Amino acid sequence: ECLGTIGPVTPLDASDFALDIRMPGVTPKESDTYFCMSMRLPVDEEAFVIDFKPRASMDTVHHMLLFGCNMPSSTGSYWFCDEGTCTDKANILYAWARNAPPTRLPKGVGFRVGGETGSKYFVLQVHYGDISAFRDNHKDCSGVSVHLTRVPQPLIAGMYLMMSVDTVIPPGEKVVNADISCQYKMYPMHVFAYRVHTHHLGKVVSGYRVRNGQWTLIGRQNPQLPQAFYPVEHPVDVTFGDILAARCVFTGEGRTEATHIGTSSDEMCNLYIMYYMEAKYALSFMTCTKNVAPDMFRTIPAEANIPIP
């Protein structure tokens, strides 16, 4: 342990405590290695994550992810995240890039963990991007501190994940569109941040809320930037009756054969939409894996198609 003697649980006032989540002194051998560790919640009952503080090496940490899950992919001290992250759904809670904004939780908003439904584990992913072979051993203890409370929060945060699966990229087609769309049928969620995931053929990912045929932008981004959470300037209310619809733009230029949307020889079109909902009607995760309203896309705004290099 990098000499740090901070302690894995720190009590705060009565109902709160901080959870130092830190790599157990690891040593990366190639630039672009993703290391993973897990931390169990110390409480069995329900708690609320209400804040984070990055503790990343200035000199080499590129990216950090924190997820919430019940079954991490390993039980050893640490592992290579290529192996997996969680065996079950890895529910993303926090993201950090060097020089990207970190996006703070709004006041009164907490992620729900523990209890019957809540994630039992945190898994931390630290991407090292920039390494010298003279570092010998080094020993890095990068991670994050997390502020938890058992004071029930009034708004609860969650992740609405949009995923594409029925789309293929014929090689050399300059522009290929992957569209996603599901009906919204829960209580109101209010969208306040978003992240976009795609492999290297992705050009731009956009996400919208369509209400009575009018599209409101949730967020838009080139997915080859640092894949952190970008804040929504004004949070978008999404409501029973509305449709959520995204739109991944790919290229097949330079490619030999058809690329699919399913490993790193595939592609992916993921849009991670981070929301809050009033506590009594809330849920921590939702997913769309379909395109139920494909014809609607002929009327999608023109900004959805314009590149962001």
Numbering used by the authors: 46 to 307, 309 to 355
What does the paper say about this structure?
The two copper atoms in PHM, CuH, and CuM (located in the N- and C-subdomains, respectively), each use a single reducing equivalent from ascorbate to catalyze the reduction of molecular oxygen for the hydroxylation of the Cα of glycine at the carboxy-terminus of the peptide substrate. Crystallographic data on apo wild-type PHM and on several crystal forms of three CuH mutants (H107A, H108A, and H172A) presented here show that the copper ions are required not only for the catalytic steps but also for substrate binding and for locking the overall conformation of PHM in a configuration that is catalytically active.
To determine whether copper at both sites is required to bind peptide substrate, crystals of apo-PHM were both soaked and co-crystallized in mother liquor containing N-Ac-di-I-YG. This peptide binds to wild-type holo-PHM in both the oxidized and the reduced forms.
